[PDB]
């Protein structure tokens, strides 16, 4: 349609110039003429965009239209001689209404310059094969007759090969299987079979601990969750018990030899469990139940230490505030647990190994929470409250958090 700028704004423009008592008709004459010129330039810019096929448009397209109009394209400056700057586009000014209009040159130096992209390259992909579009990442996607499975037999064989690679016998095969699951749209609809395979492996792993195998199963779970085509939420109900059992499972193998794997297994389980809660979040659907299970294990007296460590790892992962609120009432209980494992002349018992894992996770999580609540102070008083459970190391961890804040 036809739109004109306000007459009062034209009068203000004359007032800045110092012109006064301008005719009302003259104000109307200025607005109708200016509006036509703006519309004419917009149509001219559209012609450049249509030939360009950019659609989004590129900076200086209006400047090209101004050059076509034989009018200077410079914005925010003009040269009377016109020799230093000609019809070459100024490029415009990067200024916004939000901008304060006052800046410090030193602050701009402090800001890092961005990295530069590689030159344009040409890649060939098959849009269609024999008139059928392939499902690839580059592309957008009275006896009755015997019933046949919906999945293709070749696809079922492909699923079998991926599961064999996922077992983790060869690291390269497991990595390739994870990449294939992430990049394959066709893998969708094989998710119920994949979820059942993980659950069957996990239940056997509960009977005899297989921490290395459990970590490989978690890698397969991560690959399935990342792929967009499959519906993770529909089969999430099978996945959640399997991840929970792995985090709280007792270690059949000697604790010191497999301790590094056990910490990694708990870390993998806590991350996937929080991601499952994030997926399809609803009030009291996943997060409330998982938090309740972790809290019930921790509160229970004489809880297995491996179970306690898994519950503590899960609670810390769900929220930073959740660990901070829970630790303060149980801080005396946590100190008592460390004293109970310390008592006795035998280090063979797993209770000491479980306690050291729980305390180490608590100390690292506590240092940021203490810094967030207030600047670190009275470190000796804090050690007295802990009854020297970590002694100097707890004070050192708080100092390390302060040093990290100073570095940032």
């Amino acid at each position: 349609s036809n739109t004109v700028l306000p007459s009062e704004s034209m009068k203000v423009v004359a007032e800045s110039m110092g012109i006064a008592q301008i005719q009302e008709e003259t104000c109307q004459l200025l607005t109708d003429e200016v509006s036509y010129r703006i519309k004419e330039i917009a149509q001219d810019a559209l012609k450049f965009m249509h030939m360009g096929k950019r659609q989004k448009l590129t900076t200086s397209d209006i400047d090209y239209a101004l050059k076509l109009k034989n009018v200077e394209p410079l914005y925010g400056f003009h040269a009377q001689e016109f020799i230093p700057f000609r019809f070459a586009s100024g490029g415009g000014r990067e200024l916004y209404f939000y901008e304060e209009k006052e800046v410090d040159l030193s602050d701009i130096i402090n800001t890092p310059l961005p990295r530069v992209p590689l030159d344009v390259c040409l890649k060939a992909h098959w849009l269609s094969i024999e008139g059928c579009q392939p499902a690839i990442p580059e592309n957008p996607p009275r006896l009755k007759p015997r019933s046949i499975h919906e999945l293709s037999v070749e696809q079922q064989l492909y699923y079998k090969e991926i599961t064999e690679a996922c077992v983790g016998s060869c690291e390269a095969k497991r990595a390739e299987a994870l990449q294939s699951i992430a990049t394959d749209p066709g893998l969708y609809q094989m998710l119920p079979r994949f979820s059942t395979f993980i659950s069957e492996g996990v239940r056997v792993n509960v009977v005899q601990n297989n921490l290395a195998l459990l970590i490989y199963l978690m890698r397969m779970v991560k690959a399935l969750m990342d792929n967009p085509t499959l519906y993770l939420e529909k089969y999430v109900h099978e996945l959640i018990p399997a991840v929970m059992t792995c985090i709280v499972s007792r270690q059949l193998c000697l604790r010191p030899d497999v301790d590094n794997h056990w910490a990694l297994r708990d870390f993998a389980a806590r991350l996937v469990a929080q991601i499952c809660k994030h997926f399809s979040t609803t009030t009291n659907n996943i997060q409330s139940r998982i938090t309740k299970t972790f809290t019930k294990s921790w509160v229970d007296e004489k809880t297995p230490w491996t179970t306690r460590y898994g519950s503590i790892a899960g609670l810390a992962e769900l929220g930073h505030d959740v660990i901070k609120t829970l630790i303060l009432p149980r801080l005396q209980q946590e100190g008592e647990r460390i004293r109970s494992v310390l008592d006795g002349p035998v280090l063979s018992n797993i209770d000491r190994i479980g306690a050291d894992h729980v305390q180490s996770l608590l100390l690292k999580h506590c240092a940021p929470v203490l810094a967030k609540l207030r600047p670190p102070p009275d470190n000796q008083d804090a050690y007295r409250a802990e009854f020297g459970s970590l002694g100097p190391l707890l004070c050192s961890q708080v100092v390390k958090a302060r040093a990290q804040a100073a570095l940032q």
């Binding site: 939420e233 529909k234 959640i240």
Partner: peptide, 25 residues
Amino acid sequence: DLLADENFLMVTQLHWEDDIIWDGE
């Protein structure tokens, strides 16, 4: 509100800990 697919989802209506065998006979 009660007719939402999420309301009838198995995860909402199932208790996960009971499902795990936990080496229990």
